[PDB]
């Protein structure tokens, strides 16, 4: 009989950096997703497994809600089969993804005059992430043959960079909050 706590993920006051994206596990509750989809407050609401107005009518063993912040131009990377710094190095959806991608502009909350430098993303990585891999490493990146031994320098880079979110950014460079719902003995139903 109990309601899935989608509010505390969508309405959380603080969101994770994309490289350290948060995962919430929705289990043992009832979910009304047409209330999310009827919100009409999301610039992105693309579902990949089955119709969004037709998903209040199904059951799943486990629902995962992943959430993070990225820049606007990068929201398109949060979809199956994409490439780029986010999809390759930060958060990677599988090619056979079934689920929904929801996003909205968060310029009012996550940008600051002077620039908000708290949101970070992974800039350097030797190889692409597997689907749903979370790399929280801050080891210095070795771009040449000499080991870095924890010292930044030539061929030795800190692997993370911060988005400088300012409210005068173009919308492509403004912060967007993203929630990814993936659908995995039923525990959650409509």
């Amino acid at each position: 009989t109990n309601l899935c706590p989608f509010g505390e993920v969508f309405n959380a006051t603080r969101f994770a950096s994309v490289y350290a994206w948060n995962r919430k596990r929705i289990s043992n509750c009832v979910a009304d997703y047409s209330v999310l989809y009827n919100s009409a407050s999301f610039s992105t609401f693309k579902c990949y497994g089955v119709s969004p107005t037709k998903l209040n009518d199904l059951c799943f063993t486990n629902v995962y809600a992943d959430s993070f912040v990225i820049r606007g131009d990068e929201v398109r990377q949060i979809a199956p089969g994409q490439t780029g710094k986010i999809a390759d190095y930060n958060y990677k959806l599988p090619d056979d993804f079934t689920g929904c991608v929801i996003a909205w502009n968060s310029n009012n909350l996550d940008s600051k005059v002077g620039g908000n430098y708290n949101y970070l993303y992974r800039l350097f990585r030797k190889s692409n992430l597997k689907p749903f891999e979370r790399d929280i490493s801050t080891e210095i990146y070795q771009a040449g043959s000499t080991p870095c031994n924890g010292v930044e320098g030539f061929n030795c880079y800190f692997p993370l960079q911060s988005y400088g979110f300012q409210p005068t950014n173009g919308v492509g460079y403004q912060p967007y909050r993203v929630v990814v719902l993936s659908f995995e003995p039923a525990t959650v139903c409509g």
Partner: antibody, heavy 117, light 107 residues
Framework: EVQLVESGGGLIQPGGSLRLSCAAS????????MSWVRQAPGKGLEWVSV???????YYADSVKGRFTISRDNSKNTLYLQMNSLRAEDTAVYYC???????????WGQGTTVTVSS | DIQLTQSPSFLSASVGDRVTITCRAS??????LAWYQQKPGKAPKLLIY???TLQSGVPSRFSGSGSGTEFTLTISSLQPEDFATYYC????????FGLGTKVEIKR
């Protein structure tokens, strides 16, 4: 030392194809972002293509569908395969090590490509 | 498609002057901008990245400054070897150079 040397440029006819090579020293090509940049006679720099260390590739609209960037880790060498060349592809071609946010710090001396009937 | 416009295309000045080169973005792009120098017949050189960060080993008279929509590159006291062309560049899944600014000797 640190070095990029680009070879393979020469004269080729419109519609033909040509492969450029860029041999690096002092950093690991497959570990880095790598760009090709070109400059037509008397004109500005034009970015051409980039390869990510993880293998993703991107192209300027003016070469999309015709150029392919790639690398060979065992030769520490970067390649640009150029098909369906056109006269306006005539330029000096440079490769650079690309630090992304941090900019392109290491450049080659360039190789010249001439496309003409 | 953000458009970069660099101005002026030609700038005449003399040794010791303070020169200011501007790059204007059609939309606020934060710090996603870099500056390059090119001397004739030679490869580009990186000067500044992330708008205001001076690349290592580049003389301190070079400095950059940017709001998001207006970026300038400032040579505080022009040296004889600073006569050259300067290009601004914007990036993210692509790289785009500005048309360039040629700094020439005033007379």
């Amino acid at each position: 030392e640190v070095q990029l040397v680009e070879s393979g440029g020469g004269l080729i006819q419109p519609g033909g194809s040509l492969r450029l090579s860029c041999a690096a020293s002092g950093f690991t090509v497959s570990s880095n972002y790598m760009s090709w940049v070109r400059q037509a006679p008397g004109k500005g720099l034009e970015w051409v293509s980039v390869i990510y260390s993880g293998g993703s590739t991107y192209y300027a609209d003016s070469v999309k569908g015709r150029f392919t960037i790639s690398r060979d880790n065992s030769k520490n060498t970067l390649y640009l395969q150029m098909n369906s060349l056109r006269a306006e592809d005539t330029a000096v071609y440079y490769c650079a090590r690309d630090r992304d946010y941090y900019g392109m710090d290491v450049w080659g001396q360039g190789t010249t490509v001439t496309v003409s009937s | 498609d953000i458009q970069l416009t660099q101005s002026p295309s030609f700038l005449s000045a003399s040794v010791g002057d303070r020169v200011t080169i501007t790059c204007r973005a059609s939309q606020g792009i934060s710090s996603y901008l870099a500056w390059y120098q090119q001397k004739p017949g030679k490869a580009p050189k990186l000067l500044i990245y992330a708008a205001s960060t001076l690349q290592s080993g580049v003389p301190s008279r070079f400095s950059g400054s940017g709001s998001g929509t207006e970026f300038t590159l400032t040579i505080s006291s022009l040296q004889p070897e600073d006569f050259a062309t300067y290009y601004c560049l914007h990036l993210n899944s692509y790289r785009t150079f500005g048309l360039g600014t040629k700094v020439e000797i005033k007379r």
